[PDB]
Structures are given as structure tokens and as C-alpha cells.
Amino acid sequence: SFNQFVDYTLQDIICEDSTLILEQLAQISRKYEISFGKIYVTKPMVNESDGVTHALYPQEARLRNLTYSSGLFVDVKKRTYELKYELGKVFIGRLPIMLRSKNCYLSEATESDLYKLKECP
């Protein structure tokens, strides 16, 4: 239920209303259009208080009281219609990650690989 929401549904929610315009009234009027192509996902990370945005592991996330979460990015497309004459990676929200999912690091781990990360198999 988690992975099907990631791999498919996150494109379904965006692309179903991926366009929005603004009817500018002028006298010769104009139009402007902002659109979104594909939404892009990242790996779990923490932006610290100074500003370093590095890797993340849930053992430190359990002790530092944080959010085991990855950023999301959108390929945005801007347009302008002048009346229809036509003449970019934006962060949106750190989504919290379910453990042992495909986006998480610990899905790709052996027995001793968890043992070097202090995580029980």
C-alpha cells in the first residue's frame, strides 16, 4: 500500500490538475500558464540548523527526534499566451518515509550489513 502510492499515485495526483492559468484582462490582453511535468523523489535526508543537507540513518533519527523523510521535486513548466501565442526543479515537501520500503536505504541490506548499522534483522 505504501509503494504503490509512491510509484504511481504521486504522478496521479499531480498530473490530473497539473495546469493552472491566470486570465489577465488588458486593452490586447494576455495569459500566463504554469504547468508541472514529472514529480521527482529523493533519498532520506536532514537539513541541519546550519544548512548541511546530507545523508540520514534511522538510528540517529531515533536519538535526535527528527523525521526520517525525503524531499520531493517537481519539473515545472512556465508559459505565457499573448490570444494564444507562446513565447526548474522546485522542492515541495519532505515526505516521511515508511521503514523497509523501496525508497529507504535499509531495504538493500544483508545480515551483517544491518549489524554494522546497529539495526536488528
Partner: protein
């Protein structure tokens, strides 16, 4: 200005162009209004923090991160040429310590990164290659 007050009072590292990348404050109006607010704070009674954010902007290891730290520390005590704004003095500490190793970045990519001048840092490289002696630690 009070945003920059939160930069200094909470020990953060923000620049004027960083706020100018968000707001249109036209600089000369911005600094004098920042100046008179300081006198209000005076009437109501350190570039090292800026280093690892750019290292985070470049994605560099911690030993490489502290390599420019020992560079920027010893660059003040060595003197000669003085300040000339510490922003480019920070970025030539980056370019020296990346010339200590072999990371493929060069000056054109780091020029578009921190928004600077490639010709400026080679002039700072001229005094730095002479000063290559008093900067080694291990």
C-alpha cells in the same frame, strides 16, 4: 534587517545577496536601514560559520571541509592583502584545498555555484601559491 539580526544573534551565516535573492531591497536603502537599527540596539543596552554551507553546497567530505577551515584560520594570522571581503577569501580556501586533492570541479562550475568571478580567484591564487608554505598541517 531583523532577519539578519537573527543571522548574527542565533549564530547563523546569511549573506546580503542571499536575502537579495528573495527580496528587492536595493542594497543602499537596505544597509543604512540596517545600520540605524543597530544603533537602536546600541541605544537599547566571523566568516568561519559561512564555510561548511558552501561545502554542503559542493558536497565535500569532512576532512576536506576542515581542510579549508585550517586554511581560513591561518589565512587571517598570516596577514598581507588584508580582507578584500572574506567571501572570496573563503572560496579561494576552497579552491586551494581542492587543488590539494583531485576533485573535478574547476573554476567555471564553482563560479556559477557561489556566483563570483573566475578571474578574481586566480589573482587570489597568485598570492596563495606563494603562501603555500605556511599552511600545511600533517
Amino acid at each position: 534587517a531583523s532577519i539578519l539580526i537573527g543571522c548574527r544573534r542565533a549564530e547563523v551565516a546569511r549573506t546580503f545577496k542571499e536575502i537579495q535573492s528573495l527580496i528587492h531591497v536595493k542594497t543602499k536603502e537596505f544597509g543604512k536601514t540596517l545600520n540605524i537599527m543597530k544603533n537602536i540596539l546600541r541605544g537599547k543596552s566571523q566568516n568561519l560559520t559561512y564555510i561548511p554551507r558552501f561545502c554542503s553546497h559542493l558536497g565535500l567530505p569532512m576532512q576536506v571541509t576542515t581542510s579549508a577551515e585550517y586554511t581560513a584560520k591561518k589565512c587571517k594570522e598570516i596577514k598581507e592583502i588584508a580582507g578584500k571581503s572574506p567571501i572570496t577569501i573563503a572560496v579561494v580556501s576552497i579552491y586551494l584545498n581542492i587543488l590539494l586533492f583531485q576533485i573535478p570541479i574547476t573554476a567555471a562550475k564553482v563560479g556559477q555555484t557561489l556566483q563570483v568571478t573566475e578571474g578574481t580567484i586566480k589573482s587570489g591564487y597568485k598570492i596563495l601559491y606563494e603562501h603555500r608554505d605556511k599552511l600545511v598541517d600533517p
